[PDB]
Structure 1
Amino acid sequence: ERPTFYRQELNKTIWEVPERYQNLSPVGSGAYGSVCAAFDTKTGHRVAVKKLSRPFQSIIHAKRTYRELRLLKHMKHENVIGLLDVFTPARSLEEFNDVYLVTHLMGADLNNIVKCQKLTDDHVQFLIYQILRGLKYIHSADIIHRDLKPSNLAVNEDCELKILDFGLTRWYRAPEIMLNWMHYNQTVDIWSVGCIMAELLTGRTLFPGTDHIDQLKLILRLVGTPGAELLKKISSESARNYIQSLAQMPKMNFANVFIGANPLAVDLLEKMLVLDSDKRITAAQALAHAYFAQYHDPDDEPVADPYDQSFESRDLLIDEWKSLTYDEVISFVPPPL
């Protein structure tokens, strides 16, 4: 059975949602799409409704629409955006051109944290803990975020944190994906967490590059130029030539860079901000670091069910992706409240 939909216009955007969703209010817009806060009369909960922008403009867009829905239908973890609902006003595949996603409303993100701020910076411990707990789950299913930044980490008034916009500026980007030295593994997201943790402790962007060249220069100033064992592993000759053409920079003492920060924080930052992705701490390892002694519980840091990413290698028409997306909308089952 299909519920009753109602139509309204907000910021030059048509919203057509089921009547259970009331008091739609814009909170966000951009390339990623448009988001309204609403009230869900069924649950009694405050929700965020996202309308995808131009979901089927190109094969690239249509495949991205499919990828987002598949990723969001998979995530069942306290520190990762979960789907309460997905719908289209469309009555059949033929007039399917709009997709709406629904999740629990989150008031803020890591750019604007005040309701969490305390003198001892014990809030940093809890926020990074929740990021690592979410990344452990995502990483266990072979999902890498790749673009983690403060604006992608949503925060409640309770200071509960969730990762969103995953599996899909340059300040938080790992050196190896900015260029493509050794390709990349899951630890590209641990680099980003390092940069975020650094920014929460100091109040400044760790590495605010103006371009890719300035960005790499700011990074090598802290971590130092690659050693013998790292140079050996760069398969790109363009990258390897550039690194070696620069003057040698030493690795700095982090204790002096992050002066007066918690020495357990400085030690974790040293394990996260290593050039060589093979020796960078993993999310599972970082959770067991003494910095998180108060929060860490090995029996409450769950892993994900296996995730079928075979679709990623497939080359289909806009209409094939659109039909595959329509099937995922129909087969959706909300979590048992």
Structure 2
Amino acid sequence: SKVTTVVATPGQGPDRPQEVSYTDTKVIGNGSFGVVYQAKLCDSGELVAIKKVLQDKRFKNRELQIMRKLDHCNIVRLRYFFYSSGEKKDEVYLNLVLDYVPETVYRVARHYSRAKQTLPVIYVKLYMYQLFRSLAYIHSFGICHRDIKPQNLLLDPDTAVLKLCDFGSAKQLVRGEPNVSYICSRYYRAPELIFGATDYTSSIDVWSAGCVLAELLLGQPIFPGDSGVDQLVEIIKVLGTPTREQIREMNPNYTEFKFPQIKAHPWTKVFRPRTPPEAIALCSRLLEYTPTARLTPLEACAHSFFDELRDPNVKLPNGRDTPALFNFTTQELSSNPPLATILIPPHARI
């Protein structure tokens, strides 16, 4: 197989470009951005993902600037970036070299669902906790991901490490500067966005995360809307109709859907009989109409649903130890530093 050699720039640290060689390139996704590849690095043998995107030569890439400032165990690492030219004049591609992770939450959840099985609650705890950690970290910079869904939750089945990926929709949210409302993948889209809100906060990711939790407990998407508007109908069938106060808290640009009143479906009746109460409780505090009433990612990590993960005798079902769940930096605690007593249990303290 033919080797490609590029002069690529490290994602972290100062601009010191290095020769990087790779081989065994194969197409593994596409989208409006362009195309994504798998590849193997010649020197180490380690697998990588390569996001190739058509980038204008004048303007700076938003996703690149976000990826260069992030360093976290639950976020896919930008190893390198490089530029490659096109056939046409002034046609430049940005290439982001990211670490390869062999599975996703989507694929794993679908394995259980096709076999008529529930994902064990230990994995639900592990995967959701690490998601809320990834969100606590990005939100502390004012970065909102805006595309939290199972396909963007990468995982290693042997270690149970979860890595958040695809920062193509992500943005530094600035109070008083508008943002687009038609954002996020439909099933995971917060209700304020469906009402056309352009002044929204990082709590949209917490809604999205709540939808992921519910999906893993149910074995299927909780709000499977067949269009942008029917998405609200599906939410209403569980949560009930939002009150005018709740509609006002969502900061809408239009409220002329003309929906009939529907009563809330009790949270216990949504899920299976044997669903743990703490899972239901956590889900009730994530899937809230009022965006400010939702738990922060750090408060979510501290919920009683994740207590099993803080128990010193916890192991994975394959025999191995759990990943590093407690090495919290000051940056990731900055929203609420008194939560460290709950988040870092006695045996994990330093």
Gaps of at least 5 residues in structure 1 are: 7-16, 306-337
- Report if the CA contact (8 A) 1:176-1:183 is conserved: no
TM-superposed deviation, 1:279:
0.4
1:97 to 92, 112, 116: 92
From the superposition, tell whether residues 51 and 119 of structure 1 become closer, same or farther in structure 2 (CA, over 3 Å): closer
Provide the secondary structure at the position in 2 that maps to 1:210.
Answer: coil
Q: 1:286 to 1:186 in 2, by over 3 A?
A: same
Instruction: Report matched runs for 1:47-86 at 5 Å.
Output: 47-52=48-53, 54-56=54-56, 62-63=59-60, 66-86=61-81
Task: Name 2:82's counterpart in structure 1.
Answer: 87
1:279 to 259, 276, 293: 293
1:162 to partner: Cα distance: 1.2
Structure 2: distance between partners of 1:182 and 1:87? 34
Query: What is the CA–CA distance in structure 1 between the aligned matches of 2:142 and 2:330, rounded to whole Å?
Result: 11
Distance 2:253 2:83 in 1: 49
After superposition, the Cα gap between the structure-2 partners of 1:95 and 1:5, relative to the gap in structure 1 and judged at 3 Å, is farther
Q: The residue matched to 1:246 in structure 2 has which SS?
A: coil
Q: Number of residues paired by the alignment?
A: 281
Q: Secondary structure at the match of 1:184?
A: coil
- Aligned equivalent of 2:230: 214
Q: Using the TM superposition, name which of 116-125 and 209-218 deviates more.
A: 116-125
- Partners of 2:124 and 2:250 in 1: CA distance: 34
Distance in 1 separating the partners of 2:193 and 2:204: 7
Residues 292-314 of structure 1, C-alpha deviations (whole Å, 9 max, x = no match): 11335995233659xxxxxxxxx
Q: Counterpart of 2:290 in 1: which secondary structure?
A: coil
CA offsets, 1:104-130, max 9 Å, x none? Answer: 111222210179968643111111111
* 2:292 alignment partner, SS class: coil
Q: Is the 1:149–1:192 contact (alpha carbons within 8 Å) kept by the matching residues of 2? A: yes
Q: Which runs of 4+ in 1 moved over 4 A?
A: 114-119, 234-237, 296-299
The code of the aligned residue for 2:66 comes to: L
Match of 2:320 in 1: none
Q: How far is 1:48 from its partner?
A: 1.3
3-state SS of the aligned residue for 1:274?
coil
Equivalences for residues 294-313 of structure 1 within 5 A: 294-295=308-309, 300-302=327-329, 304=331
Equivalent runs, 1:175-190 vs 2, <5 Å: 175-181=191-197, 183-190=199-206
What residue in structure 2 maps to residue 263 of structure 1? 277
Q: Percent identity?
A: 31
The equivalent of 2:131 in structure 1 is 131
1:230–1:208 CA distance, 2 compared to 1 (3 A): same
Q: Which runs of 5+ in 2 are unaligned?
A: 7-17, 113-117, 172-184, 311-323, 333-350
Q: Please give the root-mean-square deviation of Cα atoms over the aligned residues, in Å.
A: 3.0
Report whether the alignment pairs 1:227 with 2:243: yes
Contact in 2 for aligned 1:140/1:303 (Cα 8 Å): no
Query: 1:52-86: CA deviations, max 9, x gaps?
Result: 1x2229x8xx45xx101101111100111211111
1:96 Cα shift? Answer: 7.1
The separation in 2 between residues aligned to 1:19 and 1:30, in whole angstroms, is 26
TM-score, length-normalised on structure 1? 0.74
RCO higher in 1 or 2 (8 Å CA, sep ≥ 6)?
Answer: 1
- The 1:98–1:139 alpha-carbon spacing in structure 2 relative to 1, beyond 3 Å, is same
The answer to whether the 8 A contact 1:72-1:81 is kept is no
Please report how far the alpha carbon of residue 182 of structure 1 lies from its aligned counterpart in structure 2 after TM superposition: 7.8
Structure 1 counterpart of 2:102, from 97, 107, 119: 107
State whether residues 52 and 95 of structure 2, in contact with CA within 8 Å, keep that contact through their aligned partners in structure 1.
yes
